[PDB]
Design a protein around this ligand. Sequence first.
Ligand SMILES: C[C@]1(O)C[C@@H](Nc2ncccc2F)C1
Length: 185
Amino acid sequence: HHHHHHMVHITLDRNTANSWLIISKDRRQVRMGDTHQNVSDNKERFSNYPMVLGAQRFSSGKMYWEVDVTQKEAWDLGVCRDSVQRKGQFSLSPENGFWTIWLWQDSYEAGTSPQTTLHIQVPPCQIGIFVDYEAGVVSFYNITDHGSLIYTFSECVFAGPLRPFFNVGFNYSGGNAAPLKLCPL
Ligand SMILES: C[C@]1(O)C[C@@H](Nc2ncccc2F)C1
């Protein structure tokens, strides 16, 4: 790719975080805590899963950011509608307003309905996410493998403003405590 020159400074929105997440002072890192984090509930918070949104809202243009997934067993990354469901159980699909990929149990998959198998030669330590609002495109790039394409959603029905989306995953195993980190441009 050559998408680095549409780079945007993403920060995490504390108010949308699941109440077990810990967001760094600079709002660039998030991890799963071992307990509920002494914050009030609100209607924005994701209740069932360890999810958080970016503070930035996008309704036009080309946006690019990179996330460090080093030493994680499980995560979800991408973008979602500002209007996505926050409470109870839901699937990650374009029908529900999510354009995402994930790692789960040693397999990488795109959040289609049903999910699509990804083919990645070099397990990524850093992921690039590119959104072209006008084109209706969300693409994922493997920064560890010279920016090689992972997956492209096209003809996307954004149907409103978009927010960066993150899931740090559960830590039942004790092997998934590592943070998601937004990487410097
Ligand atoms: C228990 C902790 O607070 C330390 C750990 N941090 C990291 N672990 C793995 C890769 C990168 C990290 F920054 C989460």
